[PDB]
Write a protein that holds these residues in place. Structure first.
Motif, PDB file in Angstrom:
ATOM      1  N   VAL A 297       0.842  -1.181   0.000  1.00 21.87           N
ATOM      2  CA  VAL A 297       0.000   0.000   0.000  1.00 21.87           C
ATOM      3  C   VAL A 297       0.875   1.227   0.000  1.00 21.87           C
ATOM      4  O   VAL A 297       0.545   2.213  -0.650  1.00 21.87           O
ATOM      5  N   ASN A 298       1.931   1.203   0.804  1.00 23.87           N
ATOM      6  CA  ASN A 298       2.810   2.364   0.926  1.00 23.87           C
ATOM      7  C   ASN A 298       3.481   2.645  -0.395  1.00 23.87           C
ATOM      8  O   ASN A 298       3.567   3.796  -0.824  1.00 23.87           O
ATOM      9  N   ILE A 299       3.898   1.576  -1.071  1.00 22.56           N
ATOM     10  CA  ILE A 299       4.563   1.707  -2.380  1.00 22.56           C
ATOM     11  C   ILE A 299       3.629   2.380  -3.337  1.00 22.56           C
ATOM     12  O   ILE A 299       4.016   3.327  -4.019  1.00 22.56           O
ATOM     13  N   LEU A 300       2.389   1.905  -3.391  1.00 23.96           N
ATOM     14  CA  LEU A 300       1.399   2.467  -4.325  1.00 23.96           C
ATOM     15  C   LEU A 300       1.047   3.911  -4.040  1.00 23.96           C
ATOM     16  O   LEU A 300       0.696   4.647  -4.932  1.00 23.96           O
ATOM     17  N   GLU A 301       1.115   4.299  -2.789  1.00 25.05           N
ATOM     18  CA  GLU A 301       0.824   5.650  -2.412  1.00 25.05           C
ATOM     19  C   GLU A 301       1.935   6.526  -2.976  1.00 25.05           C
ATOM     20  O   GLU A 301       1.668   7.608  -3.485  1.00 25.05           O
ATOM     21  N   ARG A 302       3.170   6.036  -2.872  1.00 27.73           N
ATOM     22  CA  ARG A 302       4.336   6.794  -3.298  1.00 27.73           C
ATOM     23  C   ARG A 302       4.404   6.859  -4.799  1.00 27.73           C
ATOM     24  O   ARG A 302       4.689   7.921  -5.352  1.00 27.73           O
ATOM     25  N   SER A 303       4.137   5.730  -5.439  1.00 30.60           N
ATOM     26  CA  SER A 303       4.226   5.617  -6.890  1.00 30.60           C
ATOM     27  C   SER A 303       3.119   4.783  -7.474  1.00 30.60           C
ATOM     28  O   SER A 303       3.289   3.593  -7.666  1.00 30.60           O
ATOM     29  N   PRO A 304       1.978   5.432  -7.803  1.00 33.00           N
ATOM     30  CA  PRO A 304       0.928   4.555  -8.318  1.00 33.00           C
ATOM     31  C   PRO A 304       1.268   3.914  -9.629  1.00 33.00           C
ATOM     32  O   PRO A 304       0.677   2.940  -9.987  1.00 33.00           O
ATOM     33  N   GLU A 305       2.214   4.483 -10.347  1.00 30.68           N
ATOM     34  CA  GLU A 305       2.427   4.122 -11.713  1.00 30.68           C
ATOM     35  C   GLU A 305       3.166   2.811 -11.904  1.00 30.68           C
ATOM     36  O   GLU A 305       2.969   2.137 -12.894  1.00 30.68           O
ATOM     37  N   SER A 306       4.011   2.422 -10.966  1.00 29.60           N
ATOM     38  CA  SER A 306       4.718   1.157 -11.134  1.00 29.60           C
ATOM     39  C   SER A 306       3.766  -0.028 -11.173  1.00 29.60           C
ATOM     40  O   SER A 306       3.963  -0.969 -11.971  1.00 29.60           O
ATOM     41  N   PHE A 307       2.742   0.036 -10.312  1.00 31.82           N
ATOM     42  CA  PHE A 307       1.738  -1.047 -10.197  1.00 31.82           C
ATOM     43  C   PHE A 307       0.793  -1.045 -11.406  1.00 31.82           C
ATOM     44  O   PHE A 307       0.593  -2.068 -12.047  1.00 31.82           O
ATOM     45  N   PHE A 308       0.283   0.141 -11.741  1.00 34.38           N
ATOM     46  CA  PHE A 308      -0.844   0.331 -12.646  1.00 34.38           C
ATOM     47  C   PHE A 308      -0.498   0.636 -14.078  1.00 34.38           C
ATOM     48  O   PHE A 308      -1.399   0.638 -14.915  1.00 34.38           O
ATOM     49  N   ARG A 309       0.768   0.928 -14.384  1.00 36.05           N
ATOM     50  CA  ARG A 309       1.119   1.381 -15.766  1.00 36.05           C
ATOM     51  C   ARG A 309       1.238   0.230 -16.736  1.00 36.05           C
ATOM     52  O   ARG A 309       1.392   0.435 -17.939  1.00 36.05           O
ATOM     53  N   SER A 310       1.197  -0.982 -16.207  1.00 38.46           N
ATOM     54  CA  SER A 310       1.170  -2.172 -17.054  1.00 38.46           C
ATOM     55  C   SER A 310       0.131  -3.150 -16.550  1.00 38.46           C
ATOM     56  O   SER A 310      -0.143  -3.246 -15.340  1.00 38.46           O
ATOM     57  N   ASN A 311      -0.478  -3.836 -17.508  1.00 38.46           N
ATOM     58  CA  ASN A 311      -1.369  -4.935 -17.212  1.00 38.46           C
ATOM     59  C   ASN A 311      -0.763  -6.289 -17.515  1.00 38.46           C
ATOM     60  O   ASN A 311      -1.390  -7.313 -17.319  1.00 38.46           O
ATOM     61  N   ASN A 312       0.485  -6.282 -17.953  1.00 39.74           N
ATOM     62  CA  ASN A 312       1.133  -7.469 -18.407  1.00 39.74           C
ATOM     63  C   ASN A 312       1.784  -8.218 -17.264  1.00 39.74           C
ATOM     64  O   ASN A 312       2.953  -8.022 -16.983  1.00 39.74           O
ATOM     65  N   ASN A 313       1.024  -9.126 -16.640  1.00 34.67           N
ATOM     66  CA  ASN A 313       1.514  -9.859 -15.483  1.00 34.67           C
ATOM     67  C   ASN A 313       2.509 -10.970 -15.802  1.00 34.67           C
ATOM     68  O   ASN A 313       3.286 -11.402 -14.939  1.00 34.67           O
ATOM     69  N   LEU A 314       2.495 -11.437 -17.039  1.00 34.06           N
ATOM     70  CA  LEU A 314       3.494 -12.392 -17.489  1.00 34.06           C
ATOM     71  C   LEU A 314       4.861 -11.720 -17.498  1.00 34.06           C
ATOM     72  O   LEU A 314       5.827 -12.267 -16.978  1.00 34.06           O
ATOM     73  N   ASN A 315       4.934 -10.524 -18.101  1.00 30.18           N
ATOM     74  CA  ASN A 315       6.205  -9.776 -18.153  1.00 30.18           C
ATOM     75  C   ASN A 315       6.707  -9.572 -16.754  1.00 30.18           C
ATOM     76  O   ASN A 315       7.883  -9.838 -16.453  1.00 30.18           O
ATOM     77  N   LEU A 316       5.805  -9.160 -15.866  1.00 26.75           N
ATOM     78  CA  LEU A 316       6.201  -8.984 -14.470  1.00 26.75           C
ATOM     79  C   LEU A 316       6.859 -10.235 -13.917  1.00 26.75           C
ATOM     80  O   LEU A 316       7.931 -10.210 -13.324  1.00 26.75           O
ATOM     81  N   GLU A 317       6.217 -11.354 -14.139  1.00 25.79           N
ATOM     82  CA  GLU A 317       6.725 -12.614 -13.606  1.00 25.79           C
ATOM     83  C   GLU A 317       8.085 -12.997 -14.194  1.00 25.79           C
ATOM     84  O   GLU A 317       8.953 -13.498 -13.483  1.00 25.79           O
ATOM     85  N   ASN A 318       8.247 -12.776 -15.484  1.00 24.21           N
ATOM     86  CA  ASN A 318       9.550 -12.966 -16.134  1.00 24.21           C
ATOM     87  C   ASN A 318      10.633 -12.026 -15.594  1.00 24.21           C
ATOM     88  O   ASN A 318      11.767 -12.434 -15.451  1.00 24.21           O
ATOM     89  N   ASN A 319      10.289 -10.774 -15.299  1.00 21.42           N
ATOM     90  CA  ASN A 319      11.228  -9.895 -14.579  1.00 21.42           C
ATOM     91  C   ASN A 319      11.666 -10.512 -13.280  1.00 21.42           C
ATOM     92  O   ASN A 319      12.824 -10.456 -12.914  1.00 21.42           O
TER      93      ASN A 319
END
Length: 324
Positions: free
Chosen positions: A85-107
């Motif tokens: 929650v704290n992360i999202l408050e600080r930077s909403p964009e890291s969480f929400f700027r992509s919908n690609n959860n596969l890419n996330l998992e590969n990262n």
DNA sequence: ATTACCGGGCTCTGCCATCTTA
DNA sequence: TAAGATGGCAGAGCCCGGTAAT
């Protein structure tokens, strides 16, 4: 139709949101309601939710399935919902700027495959969440660039240079390779500089130089050099000073200058300053405050050892008592 | 008993330019 | 052919205290 109305009851700055991502307010379906309930499910306060949406409205276009899956992936790294929650408050964009959860998992797979512990991924996500919304390819490029840079200098194993730099400078994977390259060349050119001293500097005190914006480093150095020159410091002295404490580059020109001046107005010599560079960590307010206290006591700050100017409250306050 | 040496903590976001993609 | 996805840019400190040295 219900869009503008819900945003309102949620407490969103609709004007600011509209300006940031107008395209979101032309969509037929939006999920503001679900998002709100989702974030509330996780501890987020009503205000934080409103602030999140205000800054990155496209957040309201994500589904409950995607959100929960993305959240669960982050919880493969971070131990608690409140940390997310704290992360999202600080930077909403890291969480929400992509919908690609596969890419996330590969990262996440790729970073592990780079040899980073889970504690290290946690450090990365907390300090530079963006790292996780980068394309895999982009995270790859940087890692490759750094390996190539590591061995192009004297480094006995590049994959380990990579990890050292990442720990020392969590923000390194969200910089362009262009920027970091320029900062390495800036360091090499400006100073001596033989590879083995470049390595130490890079892996040590000069690590956070690496994420400085173009020309912001060159310009800060130039100012330091000018200001110090005007005070009768030689170039070698300037160099020694900055290399002994490259954090000084981070200060804005005016603040650096003001900080010098505030010291020397109390008749501290430039020599005393550049031989004890940590005094430049303290804020002008703290410097002025302590200087007052000291001179207000027997002190002739001209001959006193000024290291106390940068000591912790506890250590400074103790030395001060003793000085009376 | 006190100072020096030194690393580590907090939290790189928020905007724009350029591509992909449907 | 407009949105969404992505890359990349500018800007800018202060404090604490563990442990070694004296």
């Amino acid at each position: 139709e219900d869009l503008l109305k819900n945003l309102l009851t949620m407490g969103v700055d609709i004007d600011m949101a509209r300006k940031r991502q107008p395209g979101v307010f032309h969509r037929m379906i939006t999920n503001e309601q679900d998002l709100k309930m989702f974030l509330l499910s996780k501890g987020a306060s009503k205000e934080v939710i409103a602030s999140i949406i205000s800054r990155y409205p496209r957040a309201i276009t994500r589904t409950p399935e995607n959100l929960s899956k993305r959240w669960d992936l982050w919880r493969k790294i971070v131990t608690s919902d409140l940390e997310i929650v704290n992360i999202l408050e600080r930077s909403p964009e890291s969480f929400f700027r992509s919908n690609n959860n596969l890419n996330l998992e590969n990262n996440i797979k790729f970073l592990y495959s780079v040899g980073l512990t889970r504690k290290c991924l946690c450090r990365l996500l907390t300090n530079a969440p963006r790292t996780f919304s980068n394309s895999l390819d982009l995270n790859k490029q940087m890692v490759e660039f750094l390996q190539a840079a590591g061995l192009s200098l004297g480094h006995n194993d590049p994959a380990d240079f990579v990890r050292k730099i990442i720990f020392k400078n969590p923000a390194i994977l969200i910089q362009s390779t262009k920027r970091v390259k320029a900062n390495i060349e800036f360091l090499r050119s400006t100073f001596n500089l033989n590879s083995e001293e470049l390595l130490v500097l890079i892996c040590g005190p000069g690590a956070e130089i690496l994420d400085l914006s173009n020309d912001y480093a060159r310009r800060s150095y130039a100012n330091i050099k000018e200001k110090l020159f005007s005070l009768g410091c030689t170039e070698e002295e300037v160099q020694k000073f900055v290399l002994s404490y490259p954090d000084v580059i981070f200060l804005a020109e005016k603040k650096f200058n003001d900080k010098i001046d505030c010291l020397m107005e109390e008749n501290i010599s430039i020599s005393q300053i550049i031989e004890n560079p940590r005094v430049l960590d303290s804020s002008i307010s703290t410097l002025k405050s302590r200087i007052k206290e000291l001179v207000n006591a027997g002190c002739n700050l001209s001959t006193l050892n000024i290291t106390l100017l940068s000591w912790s409250k506890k250590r400074y306050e103790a030395k001060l008592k003793k000085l009376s």
